[PDB]
């Protein structure tokens, strides 16, 4: 099917009409998304099948057709852009300065932008257009607004 690099919507016909359950990145022949989007199930691209290759529930990531390819990291200083792909809406770049999730195992960048659940898997990019992580796994803060981690995998 379509193997061109880019951002894709992840759709299902199981529920009412066609529903967007998430988003992902196609890079170097590999489709990258969040685990909670597909639950590790197979995907279709036209007549072609995409089979999971690697996944991890704790990282909340999954790759299809090959190993995780995205290795760029947030530099800890600069603004980034969320390339939000909301359900039924055009892809839109939103520029933001990431905050920080501080954990017992280290710090990770976080983006304070709220979008519908079906936007999970939308890529976060640096000024060179490199994907530094995916949007969609995070937390609800005191106010009630959403803060996503900048979730990146490891390129082995």
């Amino acid at each position: 099917g379509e193997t061109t690099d880019g951002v894709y919507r992840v759709m299902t016909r199981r529920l009412l009409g066609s529903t967007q359950v998430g988003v992902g990145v196609m890079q170097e022949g590999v489709f990258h998304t969040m685990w909670h989007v597909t639950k590790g199930a197979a995907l279709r691209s036209g007549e072609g099948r995409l089979d999971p290759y690697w996944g991890d529930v704790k990282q909340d990531l999954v790759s299809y057709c090959g190993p995780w390819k995205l290795d760029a990291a947030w530099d800890g200083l600069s603004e980034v852009q969320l390339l939000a792909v909301p359900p039924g809406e055009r892809a839109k770049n939103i520029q933001t300065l990431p905050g920080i999730f501080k954990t017992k195992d280290g710090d990770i960048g976080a983006v304070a932008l709220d979008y519908p659940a079906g936007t999970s898997g939308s890529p976060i990019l640096d000024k060179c257009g490199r994907v530094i992580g995916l949007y969609g796994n995070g937390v609800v803060i005191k106010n009630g607004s959403y803060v996503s981690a900048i979730t990146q995998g490891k390129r082995e």
Binding site: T12, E79, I94, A149
Partner: protein, 39 residues
């Protein structure tokens, strides 16, 4: 059954809308991949 549809190129946009704050939060990550606030 799930299927994918192209939605765009991955490129940085000059003059994109700039929004969002930068909170510093103490968080915990559980074995199920769920983040929670530590206070």
């Amino acid at each position: 059954d799930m299927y994918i549809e192209r939605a765009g190129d991955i490129t940085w946009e000059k003059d994109a809308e700039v929004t969002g704050n930068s909170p510093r939060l103490d968080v915990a990550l559980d074995e199920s991949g769920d983040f929670s606030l530590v206070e």
